Design an enzyme around this catalytic site. Structure first.
Site, mmCIF file in Angstrom:
data_model
loop_
_atom_site.group_PDB
_atom_site.id
_atom_site.type_symbol
_atom_site.label_atom_id
_atom_site.label_comp_id
_atom_site.label_asym_id
_atom_site.label_seq_id
_atom_site.Cartn_x
_atom_site.Cartn_y
_atom_site.Cartn_z
ATOM 1 N N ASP A 180 0.845 -1.191 0.000
ATOM 2 C CA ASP A 180 0.000 0.000 0.000
ATOM 3 C C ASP A 180 0.883 1.245 0.000
ATOM 4 O O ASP A 180 1.903 1.282 0.695
ATOM 5 C CB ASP A 180 -0.937 0.009 1.207
ATOM 6 C CG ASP A 180 -0.188 -0.120 2.524
ATOM 7 O OD1 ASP A 180 0.239 -1.252 2.842
ATOM 8 O OD2 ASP A 180 -0.015 0.908 3.224
ATOM 9 N N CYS A 214 -7.654 -2.119 -5.550
ATOM 10 C CA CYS A 214 -6.987 -2.398 -4.284
ATOM 11 C C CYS A 214 -7.922 -2.157 -3.103
ATOM 12 O O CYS A 214 -8.997 -2.750 -3.019
ATOM 13 C CB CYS A 214 -5.728 -1.541 -4.141
ATOM 14 S SG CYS A 214 -5.898 0.146 -4.769
ATOM 15 N N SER A 215 -7.505 -1.283 -2.193
ATOM 16 C CA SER A 215 -8.286 -0.988 -0.998
ATOM 17 C C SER A 215 -9.200 0.213 -1.219
ATOM 18 O O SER A 215 -10.407 0.138 -0.989
ATOM 19 C CB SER A 215 -7.364 -0.735 0.196
ATOM 20 O OG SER A 215 -8.086 -0.776 1.415
ATOM 21 N N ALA A 216 -8.616 1.320 -1.665
ATOM 22 C CA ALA A 216 -9.382 2.526 -1.957
ATOM 23 C C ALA A 216 -9.778 2.585 -3.429
ATOM 24 O O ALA A 216 -10.717 3.289 -3.801
ATOM 25 C CB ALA A 216 -8.588 3.764 -1.569
ATOM 26 N N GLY A 217 -9.057 1.840 -4.261
ATOM 27 C CA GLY A 217 -9.325 1.817 -5.699
ATOM 28 C C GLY A 217 -8.785 3.022 -6.456
ATOM 29 O O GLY A 217 -9.358 3.429 -7.474
ATOM 30 N N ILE A 218 -7.696 3.606 -5.972
ATOM 31 C CA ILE A 218 -7.148 4.798 -6.636
ATOM 32 C C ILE A 218 -5.640 4.801 -6.793
ATOM 33 O O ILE A 218 -5.144 5.233 -7.824
ATOM 34 C CB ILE A 218 -7.657 6.148 -6.018
ATOM 35 C CG1 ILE A 218 -7.263 6.290 -4.537
ATOM 36 C CG2 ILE A 218 -9.157 6.284 -6.189
ATOM 37 C CD1 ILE A 218 -7.633 7.675 -3.927
ATOM 38 N N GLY A 219 -4.906 4.307 -5.796
ATOM 39 C CA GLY A 219 -3.445 4.364 -5.855
ATOM 40 C C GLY A 219 -2.828 3.309 -6.756
ATOM 41 O O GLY A 219 -2.417 3.591 -7.900
ATOM 42 N N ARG A 220 -2.748 2.088 -6.223
ATOM 43 C CA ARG A 220 -2.281 0.918 -6.975
ATOM 44 C C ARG A 220 -3.117 0.663 -8.240
ATOM 45 O O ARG A 220 -2.574 0.411 -9.313
ATOM 46 C CB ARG A 220 -2.248 -0.323 -6.053
ATOM 47 C CG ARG A 220 -1.137 -0.230 -4.996
ATOM 48 C CD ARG A 220 -1.188 -1.346 -3.968
ATOM 49 N NE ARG A 220 -2.267 -1.163 -2.996
ATOM 50 C CZ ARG A 220 -2.454 -1.937 -1.926
ATOM 51 N NH1 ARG A 220 -1.630 -2.958 -1.677
ATOM 52 N NH2 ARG A 220 -3.471 -1.687 -1.098
ATOM 53 N N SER A 221 -4.436 0.736 -8.108
ATOM 54 C CA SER A 221 -5.338 0.603 -9.249
ATOM 55 C C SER A 221 -5.071 1.666 -10.333
ATOM 56 O O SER A 221 -5.063 1.351 -11.527
ATOM 57 C CB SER A 221 -6.784 0.686 -8.777
ATOM 58 O OG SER A 221 -7.133 -0.457 -8.001
ATOM 59 N N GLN A 261 -1.247 7.615 -6.157
ATOM 60 C CA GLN A 261 -1.299 8.222 -4.836
ATOM 61 C C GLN A 261 -0.005 8.817 -4.308
ATOM 62 O O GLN A 261 -0.027 9.640 -3.396
ATOM 63 C CB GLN A 261 -1.944 7.268 -3.833
ATOM 64 C CG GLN A 261 -3.453 7.453 -3.792
ATOM 65 C CD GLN A 261 -3.830 8.805 -3.198
ATOM 66 O OE1 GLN A 261 -3.543 9.068 -2.029
ATOM 67 N NE2 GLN A 261 -4.441 9.679 -4.011
HETATM 68 O O1 LIG Z 1 -1.338 2.730 -2.860
HETATM 69 C C1 LIG Z 1 -2.526 2.561 -2.517
HETATM 70 O O2 LIG Z 1 -3.405 1.854 -3.079
HETATM 71 C C2 LIG Z 1 -2.964 3.330 -1.272
HETATM 72 O O3 LIG Z 1 -4.369 3.082 -1.118
HETATM 73 C C3 LIG Z 1 -4.949 3.705 -0.060
HETATM 74 C C4 LIG Z 1 -5.190 3.153 1.175
HETATM 75 C C5 LIG Z 1 -4.827 1.712 1.664
HETATM 76 O O4 LIG Z 1 -4.945 1.569 2.913
HETATM 77 O O5 LIG Z 1 -4.453 0.847 0.812
HETATM 78 S S1 LIG Z 1 -5.935 4.220 2.292
HETATM 79 C C6 LIG Z 1 -5.976 5.452 1.083
HETATM 80 C C7 LIG Z 1 -5.422 5.044 -0.096
HETATM 81 S S2 LIG Z 1 -5.441 6.302 -1.286
HETATM 82 C C8 LIG Z 1 -6.220 7.361 -0.158
HETATM 83 C C9 LIG Z 1 -6.610 8.696 -0.385
HETATM 84 C C10 LIG Z 1 -7.243 9.458 0.624
HETATM 85 N N1 LIG Z 1 -7.599 10.763 0.318
HETATM 86 C C11 LIG Z 1 -7.258 11.439 -0.922
HETATM 87 C C12 LIG Z 1 -8.332 11.121 -1.988
HETATM 88 C C13 LIG Z 1 -8.030 11.848 -3.295
HETATM 89 N N2 LIG Z 1 -7.921 13.319 -2.988
HETATM 90 S S3 LIG Z 1 -8.228 14.415 -4.293
HETATM 91 O O6 LIG Z 1 -8.339 13.659 -5.525
HETATM 92 O O7 LIG Z 1 -7.258 15.494 -4.187
HETATM 93 C C14 LIG Z 1 -9.851 15.035 -3.834
HETATM 94 C C15 LIG Z 1 -9.885 15.342 -2.357
HETATM 95 C C16 LIG Z 1 -10.549 14.478 -1.465
HETATM 96 C C17 LIG Z 1 -10.586 14.752 -0.088
HETATM 97 C C18 LIG Z 1 -9.952 15.894 0.409
HETATM 98 C C19 LIG Z 1 -9.284 16.766 -0.465
HETATM 99 C C20 LIG Z 1 -9.251 16.492 -1.842
HETATM 100 C C21 LIG Z 1 -6.812 13.652 -2.016
HETATM 101 C C22 LIG Z 1 -7.115 12.951 -0.694
HETATM 102 C C23 LIG Z 1 -7.463 8.863 1.872
HETATM 103 C C24 LIG Z 1 -7.077 7.535 2.120
HETATM 104 C C25 LIG Z 1 -6.457 6.787 1.090
#
Ligand SMILES: O=C(O)COc1c(C(=O)O)sc2c1sc1cc(NC3CCN(S(=O)(=O)Cc4ccccc4)CC3)ccc12
Length: 297
Positions: A180, A214-221, A261
């Site tokens: 992660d 993955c977990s959040a569906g944004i970083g690794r994905s 991420q």
């Molecule tokens: O490598 C990986 O897959 C990591 O995956 C994650 C987690 C895990 O436990 O595996 S927890 C977590 C991520 S990504 C993520 C993002 C996050 N907040 C981000 C979401 C995207 N924004 S943004 O796209 O900038 C829009 C925004 C959203 C909220 C506040 C400010 C902006 C920045 C904060 C909180 C927890 C987690």
């Protein structure tokens, strides 16, 4: 351009600034449905939501909400569904979505437990003889077989719509050694896995979009899909220089927030794409090379 850019960024050591630049430019769209009170328990992370315009809607009248986004890459002509790791209450929705969207592949980039915490529900059966029934969505899921390698497992699952008794094969691709907020061990191990997914036919336009999580569906994905899309763009034009990675990522970010991420995940995407370019441009040796370097046996 990209390998030049990569060298110029490593030299100046400015990956963080480059990555933050993308964060600054990235699209911002409303996630009103995701933020509805009734859906609080359908979201794994308060800050990670699907935009309303690109969200996958469940075909039901009760509540159509799932934390999932359709990344529709028009120029590349490939779509992906990025979603969070299902929760104990959203596994039925997860499989409902796979069924309704006609997905053939599911790509899982996390482990169920990471850093002492449960990043995903056990949403598929671990044993042939103990199948899963999702009562809420009237679906049955059975483990048909699995092929375990050192750092990833491929599973064959049978998904049955209990209403119609129709059944489909889902392929489950599970990368188990991608930390992660981290990066794969090498471009080689990443590409070995991506080509496994590709070679399965799961990415074919004949099917619905592959589900990536993955977990959040944004970083690794995000990392996975960016590398794949960039290689496909390059492939269609047979022109690695025509691909602007940051531009592709920004386009992808129109469909789901936060894709990729960390600065190092972005740096890794460049590495994987540059290395994968060799195959795309007709080097028939690199694929075997990746398999060996990946230590999958
Ligand atoms: O490598 C990986 O897959 C990591 O995956 C994650 C987690 C895990 O436990 O595996 S927890 C977590 C991520 S990504 C993520 C993002 C996050 N907040 C981000 C979401 C995207 N924004 S943004 O796209 O900038 C829009 C925004 C959203 C909220 C506040 C400010 C902006 C920045 C904060 C909180 C927890 C987690």
């Amino acid at each position: 351009e990209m390998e030049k850019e990569f060298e110029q960024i490593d030299k100046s050591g400015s990956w963080a600034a480059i990555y933050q630049d993308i964060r600054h430019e990235a699209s911002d769209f409303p996630c009103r449905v995701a933020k509805l009170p009734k859906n609080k328990n359908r979201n794994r992370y308060r800050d990670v939501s699907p935009f309303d315009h690109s969200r996958i809607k469940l075909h039901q009248e009760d509540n159509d909400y799932i934390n999932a986004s359709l990344i529709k890459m028009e120029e590349a002509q490939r779509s992906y569904i990025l979603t969070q790791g299902p929760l104990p209450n959203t596994c039925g929705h997860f499989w409902e979505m796979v069924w309704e969207q006609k997905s053939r592949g599911v790509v899982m980039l996390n482990r169920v437990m990471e850093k002492g915490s449960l990043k995903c529900a056990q949403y598929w059966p671990q044993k042939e003889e103990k199948e899963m029934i999702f009562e809420d969505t009237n679906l049955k899921l059975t483990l048909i077989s699995e092929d375990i390698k050192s750092y990833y497992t491929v599973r064959q699952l049978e998904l049955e719509n209990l209403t119609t008794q129709e059944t489909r094969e889902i392929l489950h691709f599970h990368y188990t050694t991608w930390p992660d907020f981290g990066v794969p061990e090498s471009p080689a191990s990443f590409l070995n896995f991506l080509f496994k997914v590709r070679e399965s036919g799961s990415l074919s336009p004949e099917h619905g979009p592959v589900v990536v999580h993955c977990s959040a569906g944004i970083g690794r994905s995000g990392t996975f899909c960016l590398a794949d899309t960039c290689l496909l763009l390059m492939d269609k034009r047979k022109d690695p220089s025509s691909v602007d990675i940051k531009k592709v990522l920004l386009e992808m970010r129109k469909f789901r927030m936060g894709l990729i991420q960390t600065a190092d995940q972005l740096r890794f995407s460049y590495l994987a794409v540059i290395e994968g370019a060799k195959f795309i441009m007709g080097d028939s040796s690199v694929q075997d090379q990746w398999k060996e370097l990946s230590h999958e046996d």
